[PDB]
DNA sequence: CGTCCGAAGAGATTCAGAG
DNA sequence: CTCTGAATCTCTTCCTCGTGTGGTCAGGACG
RNA sequence: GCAGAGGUUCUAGCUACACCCUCUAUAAAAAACUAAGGACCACACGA
């Protein structure tokens, strides 16, 4: 089931529920905990942000790797923006301070 | 080639700042035209940075002072 | 980029600001054309264009026309991604209450108004009228008035009085009430009323009102006039499915809500009759309820397939909610899966990986290298080249896999070592090859087990994977210092076969020059692999200051053991390879290699030992066969004896000598005895039967049988797993757990009867279902453990705290379960340890206890070592490195920053799948006996009796250590004296288990004071000895006539004068409670230590750990003495007996209610200190923390959970339990506000109050005092200062509701918050970045 | 051609015993 | 007669990932 | 090569993630080339 880049989901999680449909394996909550237990904050951050749902992040990472500079443009997961919109739609203002 | 980073972490007793300093070194090697001081053996940047740290000539202090000197002659370039 | 996240109640004006329009048509799209509806849920003008920079009409279709709306339709033209953030609002004709605040457990709306929820959701459902501004009427502002009572009021309150109904009515109430006025009004009721429950409710109301006078929130905002809608791209039409466009989601709830709203608008403008309008308003309220949180009422609105359709709260909570499905853990790119393959040729720093998988995962890297080398000018041509799999592409691929680690990842990543880095070795095939050693760490089989591979992209990611996640860097598991890459199953069997000896083997006797000659002889085939031959070895030891000295000697050994010598590194001694080398021996070998040589030599040695073990296991041919499992010749006679015994027992039962219960017990006992006998016979036949010579007459050696080698070595198997093959399988239990009377006598080598196999499958199905439930329970426990943690990281290096926990080897009545050497290893002491020589600094104050220090401790015979515990650490928002100790994965102090909360949680939760679900005192060995806190008086028998209650025998040997520890029940007589040497095998204390003696402290004449035969104590007859014995009647049984008088026993001398307690003015009186048999009547002298009255008298599985960590109060809690003093009694057990303890000096404001059925170990004439147990049974951790202190409760919970883990043969270092408990009790309650801003009733995090009071005590001011409290993991996790962490865990609706009411701002600062956001983690490499960010602020 | 209709525990909530 | 403790009722989950299938608002005709 | 158009092919090709050249209102000497959509519920199975 190997995959590099493919079509993305509604929430913009790129792997699109992997099956016949070309997909990436769910780096679930247990694996996130496992990376947290390690001193991992760069591989975890990249694979929970620039590898999964950050559209600008994903495009920049692809252009960077094909350029040869493996540099992460962090940005922000679009899943968090989806969560903010869903909580706001309930009628609960959740926003960020600059 | 390398298998373990033990001697590197006895060189840098943090195991976390080591990753940061070697990542800065690899960034200098890739983005910049910086020549690695240890000659490579068909090795990637991320492992040759650890090789540099292993010999003890590259760590946070030397890297910081080196980039500071480069910035100094960057101001001094235009006099 | 952005600062802390804040959450607050959404003002209607804020909602208007959010919305870029207002939806009016319920319809979403046209089916005629997939164009969106002009005023519908999917709309271009409201939510932006459907296509990338094109209008609906198409007048403007280029990027240059950005920022200008259309003309005929007036729709903005911008990016389609703008459609994912533009929101809209619904102008509800009638205001509707938000269900989250309405049907909340505390009912925010109801609590704020201080009126019952029944009334609230009655007036919401338009079936009772509330009375807005009642004014000059009998009815008040908060008053219920249903239809008939409303008409009764209206017909005779026809004045300007108004009583509005509906959600609009509650909006009117909320507008009318002033929050500050209510607070200042209820302040005096709080200060006046002394009722605990009533004041608790008043404080709960005051908290809600204060949380609204502080936050910028209005109570009226709970009722929502406008309902926001999501951006259409967040709730899309769903795939066409051939144009079908159909799914029961938010779109459907929004459609129905808009339909009801339009109906209400039409009815309001039409002036419809009030009954129809009221019914339609109720329908709209129900629709909004279903939209926000479906299932929060009786009927969850149901779409197609008759299933509850997902709401706006079903997608924020639960496993499938956005949090745990898309934020906490999300699917990733550069990922692939396949079944796994052994591939022993690999080294643990590397793994096999298929060519296709490396081609697909590393596609961007291959494209970049192709562009750099100019093989393909463009990405597009390079992508075609990758599809053609041209030979040049493979050579490029080999370049990008030279030093590019990949993260091998098994699906159930129970602990930290579940995911590890590897250097991929390109293999042809389709199965990932996983190194054999790391399979035990992964808990991975080769039976279709699949594990994902992830590709770190950035230099930081690959570099930290190489530095941390490599299997070379993970040798010791985080749970315990023991190695995790130990030879597990097959290589250990090969080593065990290698390191043995025949008493007569080929090539035995000749001397060998060295291991090279041993290999030469074995390979040439002229000498057996294991023959006892003397060899010369150059053993290297580093006894010098790091220098390795060489020792050459002729050590008698075998050829096989000599073979391993060339494998081991120089530093290791030969004494470690000279044994049979089972699993435990190899584990100890690897641990010694790690602790002596280091890491790289340990890695190389592990690889070489794996190679040799596999090779010589292949050469061994350790097969399995029928003849390899031997049936004992005595098994038949044992079975015959058991059948005869059960026949005799059944015959006895038939006559009637033994009833069913004792017959069942006897049969079970004799069958167990027969099972033990047949097991011993099997072991004798399997390890002793082997007869082989020594070129002489006869000799007997340890067996070389296949199954014995595969079981004794620890390669794979156990005692029961080998018993079930040759010996009797044993008594097998029914589903309910009660044992089948007749066991499965037949073993697996022979056949099994059909009933025998039926009992076997009963047991097997029970075990399988138990495992299926237990894995889910362990997963839930691991989640709770991780989430009570993940805010605890090593933020400092030291704190200079002298506090800690006194580490003592644990004794539970038996032998030493864990020696102090393995209990304090890797932890930094708090105070200087001293040997028997006093004022001796054997170990300094703040030195980590590595292997050398622990070895020094054993030879100096230390008993108890005070050590710095993570609980005692005073660091805020984390702990210091010294208070934690060794990393347990690397041989040094924990790195400043490393996340230890998650490490501890995973270490605790990993063995959850391996857990389960369901006299006299005799000295063991020679040693001295001394008692702690003991009061004894010599009796006339020359023995010893105890006056205290917590006297507890500790057996001190000649080394000074405590070999044994036994609990002494009250009144138990001690045969030996204090400090008297005893010989193991004889009882020192014995007592009657069903008797509580009232032994007298001082001998003398005792007069029966207040003893009446007939009223208080009746003189019952005796039908056993002929002499009547006085038995004190029970208080409940006896009437009030004989109950008011207090029974007592006064002590007097021969002259009749009272005898006083030595040193106490109180006479030595003794109270006789109910059911007390007094054989000795009046006029009888009593010696010291003579009994006066003979007063007559659990789980250890995963649920026990869950209860311990959730701090569940036991069903029969043990009562602990809240205050220290003498005991007095009050009520005559009027339903609930009350007990009062009064100190000699202080006041006695404490009274406790105790039920009559509870046994009391305390009387009214003894002194009990605070925390001493009163009743009997399990004691709740809350009481232990309240009375005995935080250290005591931490020790109690650590010991209990370790004892639970001990029975399953799994060892977890106590620091993990300690840090989890520290996270449990991080909350505190401020008993006295003092000068702090914190209120008394308020509970705040212990870090907050500690910082505040330390700042107050820094200057001349006096800080506020607090009372720490212990709460469970599932309660400590939700009750956290971070709303975005508690919301992601559990009860998301409640947490979000409380946060929105509070207006509390989350400051991130925790691992899981920064994970949800997607920024750097304050755990490893991100800790330095976060500390730089903090120092830059 | 478009448009309108089990189970397990915790906590809130009654609810009750006793002066 | 007003709270106390206690029974009652209601909420809130109850592992973690894969791979094959199959079923899903369903406006419908009229200006 | 960043706002548009044209070119030798093949309707259309202006960096749309995207591939060559020209200039700011004008269309051709020129070979390698092209496309940027996609959910939930149930079943069975594996670890
Ligand atoms: Mg398996």
From TrEMBL, chain C:
Names of the cofactor(s): Mg(2+); Zn(2+)
InterPro entries found in the cross-reference section: DNA-dir_RpoC_beta_prime (IPR045867), DNA-dir_RpoC_beta_prime_bact (IPR012754), RNA_pol_asu (IPR000722), RNA_pol_N (IPR006592), RNA_pol_Rpb1_1 (IPR007080), RNA_pol_Rpb1_3 (IPR007066), RNA_pol_Rpb1_3_sf (IPR042102), RNA_pol_Rpb1_4 (IPR007083)
Binding, Mg(2+): 445, 447, 449
EC number(s) per entry: 2.7.7.6
Cofactor binding, per record: Binds 1 Mg(2+) ion per subunit.
N6-acetyllysine PTM positions: 954
Record-listed Zn(2+) 1 binding positions: 55, 57, 70, 73
Record's catalysed reaction(s): RNA(n) + a ribonucleoside 5'-triphosphate = RNA(n+1) + diphosphate
Chain sites annotated for binding Zn(2+) 2: 799, 873, 880, 883
SUPFAM superfamilies: beta and beta-prime subunits of DNA dependent RNA-polymerase
Any one GO molecular-function label of the UniProt entry: DNA-directed RNA polymerase activity
Keyword set, alphabetical order: Acetylation, Coiled coil, DNA-directed RNA polymerase, Magnesium, Metal-binding, Nucleotidyltransferase, Stress response, Transcription, Transferase, Zinc
Classification via Pfam families: RNA_pol_Rpb1_1, RNA_pol_Rpb1_2, RNA_pol_Rpb1_3, RNA_pol_Rpb1_4, RNA_pol_Rpb1_5
UniProt domain RNA polymerase N-terminal: residue ranges: 220-499
Entry GO CC: cytosol; DNA-directed RNA polymerase complex
GO biological process, one term: DNA-templated transcription
Coiled coil: 169-203
Known role: DNA-dependent RNA polymerase catalyzes the transcription of DNA into RNA using the four ribonucleoside triphosphates as substrates.
The family this protein is said to belong to: Belongs to the RNA polymerase beta' chain family. In the C-terminal section; belongs to the RNA polymerase beta' chain family.
Subunit structure, as described in the record: The RNAP catalytic core consists of 2 alpha, 1 beta, 1 beta' and 1 omega subunit. When a sigma factor is associated with the core the holoenzyme is formed, which can initiate transcription.
Entry-linked NCBIfam families: rpoC_TIGR
Protein name (Swiss-Prot/TrEMBL): DNA-directed RNA polymerase subunit beta'
Source organism per UniProt: Escherichia coli
């Amino acid at each position: 089931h190997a995959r590099s880049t493919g079509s993305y989901s509604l929430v913009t999680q790129q792997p699109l529920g992997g099956k016949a449909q070309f997909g990436g394996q769910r780096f679930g909550e247990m694996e996130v905990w496992a990376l947290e237990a390690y001193g991992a904050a760069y591989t975890l951050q990249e694979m929970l942000t620039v590898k999964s749902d950050d559209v600008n992040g994903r495009t920049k990472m692809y252009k960077n790797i094909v350029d040869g500079n493996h540099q992460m443009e962090p940005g922000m997961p679009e899943s968090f923006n989806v969560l903010l919109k869903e909580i706001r739609s309930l009628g609960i203002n959740i926003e960020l301070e600059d | 080639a390398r298998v373990t980073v033990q001697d590197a972490v006895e060189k840098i007793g943090n195991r976390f700042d080591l990753v940061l300093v070697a990542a800065r070194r690899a960034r200098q090697m890739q983005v910049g035209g910086k020549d690695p001081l240890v000659p490579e053996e068909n090795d990637k940047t991320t492992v040759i940075a650890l090789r540099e740290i292993e010999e003890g000539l590259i760590n946070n202090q030397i890297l910081d002072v080196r980039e500071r000197q480069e910035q100094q002659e960057q101001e001094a370039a235009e006099l | 980029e952005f600062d802390a996240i804040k959450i607050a109640l959404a003002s209607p004006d804020m909602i208007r600001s959010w919305s870029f329009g207002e939806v009016k048509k319920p319809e979403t799209i046209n089916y005629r054309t997939f164009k969106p509806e002009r005023d519908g849920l999917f709309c271009a003008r409201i939510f932006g264009p459907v296509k990338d920079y094109e209008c609906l009409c198409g007048k403007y279709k280029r990027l240059k026309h950005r920022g200008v709306i259309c003309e005929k339709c007036g729709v903005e033209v911008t990016q389609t991604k703008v459609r994912r953030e533009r929101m809209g609002h619904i102008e509800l004709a009638s205001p509707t209450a938000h269900i989250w605040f309405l049907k909340s457990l505390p009912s925010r709306i109801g609590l704020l108004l201080d009126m019952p929820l029944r009334d609230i959701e009655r007036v919401l459902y338009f079936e009772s009228y509330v009375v807005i501004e009642g004014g000059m009427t009998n009815l008040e502002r908060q008053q219920i008035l249903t239809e008939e009572q409303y008409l009764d009021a209206l017909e005779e309150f026809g004045d300007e009085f108004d009583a509005k109904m509906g959600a609009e009515a509650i909006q009117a109430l909320l507008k009318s009430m002033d929050l500050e006025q209510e607070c200042e009004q209820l302040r005096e009721e709080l200060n006046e009323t002394n009722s605990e429950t009533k004041r608790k409710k008043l404080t709960k109301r005051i908290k809600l009102l204060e949380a609204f006078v502080q936050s910028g929130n209005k109570p009226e905002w709970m009722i929502l006039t406008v309902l926001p809608v999501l951006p259409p791209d967040l709730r899309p039409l769903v795939p066409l499915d051939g144009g079908r466009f159909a799914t029961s989601d938010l779109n459907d709830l929004y459609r129905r809500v808009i339909n009801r709203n339009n109906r209400l608008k039409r009815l309001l403008d039409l002036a419809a009759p009030d009954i129809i309008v009221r019914n339609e308003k109720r329908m709209l309220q129900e629709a909004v309820d279903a939209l926000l949180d479906n299932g929060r009422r009786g009927r969850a609105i149901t779409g197609s397939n008759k299933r509850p359709l997902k709401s706006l709260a079903d997608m924020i909570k639960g496993k499938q909610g956005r949090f745990r499905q898309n934020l906490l853990g999300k699917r990733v790119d550069y990922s692939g899966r396949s079944v796994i393959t052994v591939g022993p040729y690999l080294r643990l720093h590397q793994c096999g990986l298929p060519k296709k998988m490396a081609l697909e995962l590393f596609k961007p890297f291959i494209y970049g290298k192709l562009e750099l080398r100019g093989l393909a000018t463009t990405i597009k041509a390079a992508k075609k080249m990758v599809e053609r799999e041209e030979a040049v592409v493979w050579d490029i691929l080999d370049e990008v896999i030279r030093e590019h680690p990949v993260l091998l990842n098994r699906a159930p990543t129970l602990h930290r070592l579940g995911i590890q880095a590897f250097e991929p070795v390109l293999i042809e095939g389709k199965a990932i090859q996983l190194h054999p050693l790391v399979c035990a760490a992964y808990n991975a089989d080769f039976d279709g087990d699949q594990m994902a591979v992830h590709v770190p992209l950035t230099l930081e990611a690959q570099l930290e994977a190489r530095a941390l996640m490599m299997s070379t860097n993970n040798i010791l598991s985080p749970a315990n210092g023991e190695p995790i890459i130990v030879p597990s199953q097959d290589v250990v069997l090969g080593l065990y076969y290698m390191t043995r000896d025949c008493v007569n083997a080929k090539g035995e006797g000749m001397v060998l020059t060295g291991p090279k000659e041993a290999e030469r002889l074995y390979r040439s085939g002229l000498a057996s692999l294991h023959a006892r031959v003397k060899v010369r070895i150059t053993e290297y030891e580093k006894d010098a200051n790091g220098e390795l000295v060489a020792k050459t000697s002729l050590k008698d050994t075998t050829v096989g053991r000599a073979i391993l010598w060339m494998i081991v590194p120089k530093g290791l001694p030969y004494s470690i390879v000279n044994q049979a080398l089972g699993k435990k021996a190899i584990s100890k070998m690897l641990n010694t290699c790690y602790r002596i040589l280091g890491l790289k030599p340990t890695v190389i040695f592990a690889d070489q030992i794996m190679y040799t073990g596999f090779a010589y296991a292949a050469r061994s041919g350790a097969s399995v066969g029928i003849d390899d499992m031997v049936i004992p010749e005595k098994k038949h006679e044992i079975i015959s004896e058991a059948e005869a015994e059960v026949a005799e027992i059944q015959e006895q039962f038939q006559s009637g000598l033994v009833t069913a219960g004792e017959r069942y017990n006897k049969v079970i006992d004799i069958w167990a005895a027969a099972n033990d006998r047949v097991s011993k016979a099997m072991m004798d036949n399997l390890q002793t039967e082997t007869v082989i010579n020594r070129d002489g007459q006869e000799e007997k050696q340890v067996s070389f049988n296949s199954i014995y080698m595969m079981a004794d070595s620890g390669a794979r198997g156990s005692a029961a797993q080998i018993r079930q093959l040759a010996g009797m399988r044993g008594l097998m239990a029914k589903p309910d757990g009660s044992i089948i009377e007749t066991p499965i006598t037949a073993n697996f080598r022979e056949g099994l009867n059909v009933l025998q196999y039926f009992i076997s499958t009963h047991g097997a199905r029970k075990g399988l279902a138990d495992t299926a439930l237990k894995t889910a329970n362990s997963g839930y426990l691991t989640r709770r453990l991780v989430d009570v943690a993940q805010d605890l990281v090593v933020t400092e290096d030291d704190c200079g705290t002298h506090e800690g926990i006194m580490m003592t080897p644990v004794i539970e009545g038996g032998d030493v379960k864990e020696p102090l050497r393995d209990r304090v290893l890797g932890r930094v002491t708090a105070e200087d340890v001293l040997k028997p020589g006093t004022a001796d600094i054997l170990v300094p104050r703040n030195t980590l206890l590595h292997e050398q220090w622990c070895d020094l401790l054993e030879e100096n015979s230390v008993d108890a070592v005070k050590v710095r515990s993570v609980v005692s650490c005073d660091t805020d928002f984390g702990v210091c490195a010294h208070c934690y100790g060794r990393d347990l994965a690397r041989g040094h102090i924990i790195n400043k920053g490393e996340a230890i909360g998650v490490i501890a949680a995973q270490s605790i939760g990993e063995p959850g799948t391996q857990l389960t679900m369901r006299s006299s005192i005799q000295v063991k060995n020679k040693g001295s006996i001394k008692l702690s806190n003991v009061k004894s008086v010599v009796n006339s028998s020359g023995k010893l009796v105890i006056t205290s209650r917590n006297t507890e025998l500790k057996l001190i040997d000649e080394f000074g250590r405590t070999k044994e520890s036994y609990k002494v029940p009250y009144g138990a007589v001690l045969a030996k004296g204090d400090g008297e040497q005893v010989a193991g095998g004889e009882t020192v204390a014995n007592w009657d288990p069903h008797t509580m003696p009232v032994i007298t402290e001082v001998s003398g004449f005792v007069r029966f004071t207040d003893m009446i035969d007939g009223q208080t104590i009746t003189r019952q007859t005796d039908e056993l000895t002929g002499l009547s014995s006085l038995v004190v009647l029970d208080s409940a049984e006896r009437t009030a006539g004989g109950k008011d008088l207090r029974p007592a026993l006064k002590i007097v001398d021969a002259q009749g004068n009272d005898v006083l307690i030595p040193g106490t003015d109180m006479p030595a009186q003794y109270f006789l409670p109910g059911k007390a048999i007094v054989q000795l009547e009046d006029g009888v002298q009593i010696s010291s230590g003579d009994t006066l009255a003979r007063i007559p008298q659990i789980t250890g599985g995963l649920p026990r750990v869950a209860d311990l960590f959730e701090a569940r109060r036991p069903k029969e809690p043990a009562i602990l003495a809240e205050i220290s003093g003498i005991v007095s009694f009050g009520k005559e057990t009027k339903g609930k007996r009350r007990l009062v303890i009064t100190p000699v000096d202080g006041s006695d404001p404490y009274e406790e209610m105790i039920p009559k059925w509870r046994q009391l170990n305390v009387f009214e004439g003894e002194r009990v200190e605070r925390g001493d147990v009163i009743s009997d049974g399990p004691e709740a951790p809350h009481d232990i923390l309240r009375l005995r202190g935080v250290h005591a409760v931490t020790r109690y919970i650590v010991n209990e959970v370790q004892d639970v883990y001990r029975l399953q043969g799994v060892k977890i270092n106590d620091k993990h339990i300690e840090v989890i408990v520290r996270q449990m009790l991080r909350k505190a309650t401020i008993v006295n506000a003092g000068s702090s801003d914190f209120l008394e009733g308020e509970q705040v995090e212990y870090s907050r109050v500690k910082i505040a009071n330390r700042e107050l005590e820094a200057n001349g001011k006096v800080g506020a005092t607090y009372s720490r409290d212990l709460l469970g993991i599932t309660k400590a996790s939700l009750a956290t200062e971070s709303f975005i962490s508690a919301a992601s865990f559990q009860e998301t609706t409640r947490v979000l509701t409380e946060a929105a009411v509070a207006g509390k701002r989350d400051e991130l600062r925790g691992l899981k918050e920064n994970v949800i956001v997607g920024r750097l983690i304050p755990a490893g490499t991100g800790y330095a970045y976060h500390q730089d960010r903090m120092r830059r602020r």
